[PDB]
Amino acid sequence: QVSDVGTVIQVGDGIARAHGLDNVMSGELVEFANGVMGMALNLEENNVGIVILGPYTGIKEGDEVRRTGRIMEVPVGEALIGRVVNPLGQPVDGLGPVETTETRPIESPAPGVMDRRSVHEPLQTGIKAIDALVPIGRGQRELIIGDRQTGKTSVAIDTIINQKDQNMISIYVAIGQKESTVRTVVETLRKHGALDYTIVVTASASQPAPLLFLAPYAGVAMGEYFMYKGKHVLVVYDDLSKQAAAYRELSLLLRRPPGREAYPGDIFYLHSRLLERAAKLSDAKGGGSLTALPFVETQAGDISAYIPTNVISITDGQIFLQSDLFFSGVRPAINAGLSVSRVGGAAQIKAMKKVAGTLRLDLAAYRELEAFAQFGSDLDKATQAKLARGARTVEVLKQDLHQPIPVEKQVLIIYALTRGFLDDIPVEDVRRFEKEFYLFLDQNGQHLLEHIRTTKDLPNEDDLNKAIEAFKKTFVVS
Amino acid sequence: MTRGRVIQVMGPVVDVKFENGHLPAIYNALKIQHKARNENEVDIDLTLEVALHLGDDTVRTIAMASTDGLIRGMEVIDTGAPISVPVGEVTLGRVFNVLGEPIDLEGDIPADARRDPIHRPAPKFEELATEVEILETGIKVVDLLAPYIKGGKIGLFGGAGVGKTVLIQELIHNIAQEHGGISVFAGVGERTREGNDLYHEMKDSGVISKTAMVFGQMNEPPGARMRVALTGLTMAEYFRDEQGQDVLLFIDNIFRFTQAGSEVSALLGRMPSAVGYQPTLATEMGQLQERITSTAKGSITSIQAIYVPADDYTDPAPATTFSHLDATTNLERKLAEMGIYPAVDPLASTSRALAPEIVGEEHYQVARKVQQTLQRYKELQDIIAILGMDELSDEDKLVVHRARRIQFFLSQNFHVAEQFTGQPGSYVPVKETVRGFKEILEGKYDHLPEDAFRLVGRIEEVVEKAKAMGV
Amino acid sequence: MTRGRVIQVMGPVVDVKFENGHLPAIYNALKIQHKARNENEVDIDLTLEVALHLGDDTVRTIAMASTDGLIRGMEVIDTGAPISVPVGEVTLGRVFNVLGEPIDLEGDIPADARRDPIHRPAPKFEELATEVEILETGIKVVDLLAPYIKGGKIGLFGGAGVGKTVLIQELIHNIAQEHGGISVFAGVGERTREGNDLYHEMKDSGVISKTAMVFGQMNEPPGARMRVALTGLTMAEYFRDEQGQDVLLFIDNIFRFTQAGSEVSALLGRMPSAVGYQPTLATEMGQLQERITSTAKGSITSIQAIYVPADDYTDPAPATTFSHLDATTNLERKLAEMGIYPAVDPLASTSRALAPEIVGEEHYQVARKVQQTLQRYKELQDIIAILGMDELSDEDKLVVHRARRIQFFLSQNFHVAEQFTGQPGSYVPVKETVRGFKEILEGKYDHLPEDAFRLVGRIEEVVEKAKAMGV
């Protein structure tokens, strides 16, 4: 046996200084006497700054550090599907080891400008508001932002669950969470049956800050292994603010000078590196894709903060969740005024596009008109009609929890709303109207659903009108 | 023999230099004993906790007591183990300090009693439990809008003088008497007056002989305040694991733990964080919080008070701890000054347990309607403050008319507060409070004055108070 | 020959020690071309740029790619000249990275092609030009309020997600089709998806035959993000100087340049400035902006998108970059939330060509009347919200009613925005814009519904939409 060996100088707070290691590479893996792995970041002239990836209570000054000759790497393979695992690829669910056979570097270049193809296929989330106002396509990255206790985790769970039929792999990465919460999420996924095609990566709050800093990179490294083979991957970063805090702590412990709010200057570079790997590969690359839904947790709904703006400038679109809308009865509380999707239209099927291209703009205009016209009772006929239509649309967009809806029914209900067939139902009855409409479509007009599912286009408009009128005749106002 | 030597003394931080090849491990405990050699010295009996390895066989430690009288070059003895605290049936009915020494004047603990190290890794993923069920407390707002979870973590946020201590005392009165398991109280950075009052109250009520108490108070240096909570936690973990018994953990003002950490961190050589806090704020909190969990062997339900500096809920210490809790109640100074107690914020307070299948459809609908009306009333406040009621539409008039009554009915008269106002106080069940709120929402009491809804329970008391007032 | 070696590696900053007798000049390009001697090494082909002279024959440099795999002691070759990129007609129809290497998979540039250094002093005072000409764009708000100047510098301010990229794509589609000259695009720190979409749009339109592109695209390190813009600038400067062409220069998110500078400043060792930026912010920005001018040899007109952090125009970067522009358009989120695009602020946007002798007296009068009506409307927005619309005077009701029409008519349907709008898009001349706005001001269309004026184009489209709505 032979290996370059260093010796430790300082230990504390998960950071170690070592002497020696002449031929250590930047960003390499090292292991101490206990077998705890470590990462080398600062290659100073006299010493090397080592970042510890485990419990450092067993490391004492004077111990020996052994080089390993490998960059940071994580195991990959189909054997990870249906498992809960550390960022290092070590299982925690206690169901035995994972029989992986290859690894991928955790720091890899993103696909270039000549490798990608424009996003052109949809990602159905089963949520009416998201699928109608801010559509998401495969290869797009969409940010979910809001205050605590608003519905971000529930939205992500519903999105993952709805992918049961499509040939898509899901990856859920929990950063800085609580272990009981992670177990609860895993249990819900298992109950609804989504564990057959998903991987859970967890780095709880008890873990040292380096593992929290590395977890999203491990998740995206696991995802892109499937991406480059022609699969389709969905990745959910449970909180990037936690990663930012962990990185700030690590940098401050390494004595790097701080910037705004004690953050290191390279936080934007960190997030850009993490999020730029999502792509829609061209046909020469196999056509695989990887879509990402990072999370950001604000304070008091201040969307104009440092980390929120930094993340917003990187992603394609944002879904903004509002506490005021949440507590006023509007759930999932999508604030369509601030939400936007930069890939709209191209990420919707033909029928959905031609039915709801203008819905977001009309809803924003209705919000502004409701804000203004509240200041006076002498209202015009057009304003009254617009207010009624806006109220009915807002009532339509409400949705319960764990109730996914097929797009072939979303398009039908939104068509019925936008063509004026809902103009006479009282605002309090729209939910029951939609329930009865789905029940009636489950028996009559099944050929409409078949045609929509097959051709991805609206059926003959006469049949739509006939079916809607037939349902309205048997519909009775409460 | 392996012995040290004091090099530097900087407040609560002491440096020890050891003979080569015998450095103690991190979190070990070092002992300093020194008889005065002459009249220019004082006797010293003190203990230290290792925190860092600086190099050149030098170790940086944190003292658990005042460092006055330390002399450079004094001799330090190592123990080779972390701080150890007695556990078992011995600890029931006693009062301890951070070092595990009893202070109740009831005697001393035998030297052969089993004791366990304070520091240990958190429970693993496969050991945790997930069952959720409601813990009835008898407080209207808690039982309606944010039910408490049996076996979970509960947090109480509030500024200075808002009611956290009174709320905890009411919870102790309403739960600990009938709990039947084991209780432990760990006061951290609180008044010794309050500690003594609580001890005497428990002795009078007889709750002692099934409870243990640990006290690190305001007068202690930051070293003791950083570890008193861990001492209480390692006492509770024994009852959780080795006996499989239900454990009830009360922690008073857990914010002092992170405050003491921040105070110490400056002298350790760390650079300041955003608001002067330590860089390790998240990990230090997580290491403590992750051990308070319910496993398959047993369950711990923990109630923690959390202080909020300068009423700023965006402060990093309150902000980071929101992710470690299951049900939170946020007290508000605006409500406290208005005269409504316990001044719980009805919209900011959240709970994982408020689900239709956990509390029932009627409960869920009533809670949602109450929250909706309160949100609308909160929206109307800016216009109300200028133009008053006289410009509102007919619907908004009714919204305000009902929101005032709902808000007032959310208050209650606690048993503990009987010493402040003389009113006996009351205990209300979940079904009763749900029925009362449903009746109010249906409009069955719009003819009563709003002052009749204040500081009463069971709605029949509202009716009786209105009749007494002459309605 | 003489070589250096690597001393320190700190992220994107590398220390190199050179033998005595030869120190590379500042901004010289260094090379690292190491090969793996054994299994435990990885091949590296990396280039460096000199930044400082630290003393003792040591140089502080900045890397152009990831430094992973670097080993202390690797050999560094000095090239004796700054980074040089090919210029001329070879560049047309190609896509380059920072180092001038093609990435379009169309074949490598011949080794004998002419190359020019990136860094060069700015043009003298006596070489500049002074004439002003209006550049018609086809956008109503831009053509009316803040006209663009041919051969001048134009900036598109705005926050995140407000419309800068869409507006610049619309401008490209409007003017580059028939510009009749050379065009250059510089992708500084943007989304690779946007870059690919733009490249394929140009490939479809056929404009790619007369334009050249460079991309940094937000994932390359700050070393490359601080030089891609200068690479594009020298590519355009060759055409301006040696051929006297008329050049369009499009730079996306010039703010990324100063952002990367701030990222690398602390590691370079400079003291921090006010908001965390580098002290050399103003001079670094000036040494780049001053090179983009129009001289007697030729004229370059540049359109630059400037990102405003946190929607705050008082941030140092926008504050200092305002002084370098002739005509500016300010985008704000308030108009974006109302659903009107391109959401150009009709107040903050200014142009130095807005003079009676340049655009016409009637044009100036219409612009001033529109601006004063909108300013008057902006002042009533506060009192209206809590005093109602009725309490205003009759004339103020009229100005509000007409200002709503003006504000809604300032929007336009873009060809590029077809995905987001479902409409083909329209192009409208200055004469139509001014005549329509004059008519709206004079009140010829007070009867038409408010909702009919948005995303239309001409007043003929306004009246047709109103008629189709049933009026």
Ligand SMILES: Nc1ncnc2c1ncn2[C@@H]1O[C@H](COP(=O)(O)OP(=O)(O)OP(=O)(O)O)[C@@H](O)[C@H]1O
């Ligand atoms: N239709 C709904 N959509 C979303 N959440 C809902 C809905 N109905 C009820 N809820 C409840 O709202 C709460 C908010 O959901 P969730 O916990 O996912 O939010 P979050 O902001 O992502 O959480 P956290 O900040 O704790 O990570 C949950 O308790 C959920 O059960």
Ligand SMILES: Nc1ncnc2c1ncn2[C@@H]1O[C@H](COP(=O)(O)OP(=O)(O)OP(=O)(O)O)[C@@H](O)[C@H]1O
């Ligand atoms: N339920 C209540 N009924 C009546 N008065 C109350 C109630 N709760 C609090 N108070 C009043 O407010 C005071 C707050 O006392 P408490 O010790 O609970 O405050 P605290 O918010 O925990 O503050 P501190 O930081 O001082 O511990 C009480 O002494 C009492 O005067």
Ligand SMILES: Nc1ncnc2c1ncn2[C@@H]1O[C@H](COP(=O)(O)OP(=O)(O)O)[C@@H](O)[C@H]1O
């Ligand atoms: N002229 C426009 N017409 C319609 N929508 C627009 C227009 N400009 C911007 N948008 C909206 O903004 C989004 C694109 O914003 P973008 O220009 O990428 O922001 P940024 O300027 O920060 O890059 C699109 O999803 C679109 O909905």
Ligand SMILES: [Mg+2]
């Ligand atoms: Mg959540």
Ligand SMILES: [Mg+2]
């Ligand atoms: Mg108190």
Ligand SMILES: [Mg+2]
């Ligand atoms: Mg952009």
